[PDB]
Ligand SMILES: C[S@@+](CC[C@H](N)C(=O)[O-])C[C@H]1O[C@@H](n2cnc3c(N)ncnc32)[C@H](O)[C@@H]1O
């Protein structure tokens with residue numbers, strides 16, 4: 001079973017309001033071999049709570065990281081969107097903070113090592129840390145040195161001893177996946193020199209609330225983060241938030257730079273600005289999260305009836321992409337193989353498998369192109385621009401997409417938008 005949250009990860013208080021509860025839900029990245037039955041499929045409570053002190057949003061429970069990540073088989077996206085964004089991460093880190101060539105960049109949750117590869121092409125020394133054994137072996141094979149472990153205070157000390165002081169420590173979409181964020185902050189503090197930086201990229205709570213991105217709630221995602229809660233945490237570990245960049249990726253994200261409290265790096269005014277913006281948009285008030293809650297109920301209900309209505313008219317519907325978040329979407333909406341006949345997905349490992357809970361089949365794009373699908377529910381909506389850009393033939397044939405946020409809508413729209 002999953003361990004229950006007592007006190008807050010960031011600020012250490014214990015005072016939260018309930019925001020939404022989806023009950024027991026199977027793990028979003030636990031895809032299944034098809035056929036037979038699925039009686040023993042594990043399910044865990046999926047509910048979110050908001051800490052009234054620092055306003056970290058968090059799941060009620062913490063599924064064991066060993067279970068989640070040790071055989072995590074899914075590689076970093078090889079999409080043009082992510083290739084470009086990884087190049088941008090390098091650019092921002094190097095150019096904004098003046099990291100010279102030959103500097104050392106450590107990455108937490110480095111996966112297959114593609115982000116590090118880009119840092120190596122910019123002339124940097126690198127090292128990865130990722131517990132997915134399979135994936136770490138691929139990175140190591142490719143020539144990108146990766147320790148096959150979770151990040152910790154002791155692994156941090158092993159890195160310092162063997163590899164030295166990093167000019168940059170990077171964690172992309174991994175900081176929200178770690179329960180003991182205090183230990184990370186400690187390992188980081190020990191690692192950083194006077195002008196070293198700790199940069200983390202996470203989905204921005206402001207964007208999640210405003211665009212009603214409830215499908216981004218899943219067990220892997222323990223935290224849902226704003227700038228406020230991070231300052232609260234780093235205060236308690238001799239670390240200080242020095243800069244933030246808002247990004248379009250993954251439905252609205254923040255790339256947060258953190259340095260030693262008593263180090264070289266000055267705090268930029270942007271940090272205060274975003275903290276003021278968070279207050280100004282109701283993040284410290286109960287109503288905001290009750291409003292989120294009904295938006296979810298509204299979107300969930302109108303998404304299912306929209307799907308079931310179209311099916312009743314004799315239209316065929318499939319899912320486009322089989323991302324982790326799509327499995328929250330379809331489980332919460334209670335959709336099944338009768339509603340979506342398959343989900344197409346470019347991930348070879350996923351092809352031939354079946355989705356968690358809903359048990360919808362996952363098929364290949366080459367198969368999908370042989371089927372007369374009228375609507376695709378766009379589950380990988382964070383890649384909307386890239387996806388729509390290569391689906392001209394489908395759209396030209398009168399095919400349509402259903403987007404789940406900010407509100408359910410049909411692409412193409414009825415008129416040209418300027
Ligand atoms: C969703 S992925 C992020 C992959 C990559 N950073 C990206 O942005 O595409 C989460 C990755 O972090 C790894 N991970 C999870 N918990 C970790 C921890 N405590 N320390 C280091 N890596 C971790 C997982 O094995 C997985 O490869």
Ligand SMILES: Cc1cn([C@H]2C[C@H](O)[C@@H](COP(=O)(O)OP(=O)(O)O)O2)c(=O)[nH]c1=O
Pocket residue numbers: 074077079320321322323324325344345346347350380382383386387
């Ligand atoms: C960009 C793109 C992604 N996909 C799929 C590949 C991935 O399995 C999924 C995107 O998942 P992603 O959001 O990158 O991560 P996660 O594995 O946590 O969901 O969508 C397509 O099928 N076609 C596409 O054009």
Ligand SMILES: [Zn+2]
Pocket residue numbers: 008009010011012013051052053054055056
């Ligand atoms: Zn808190």
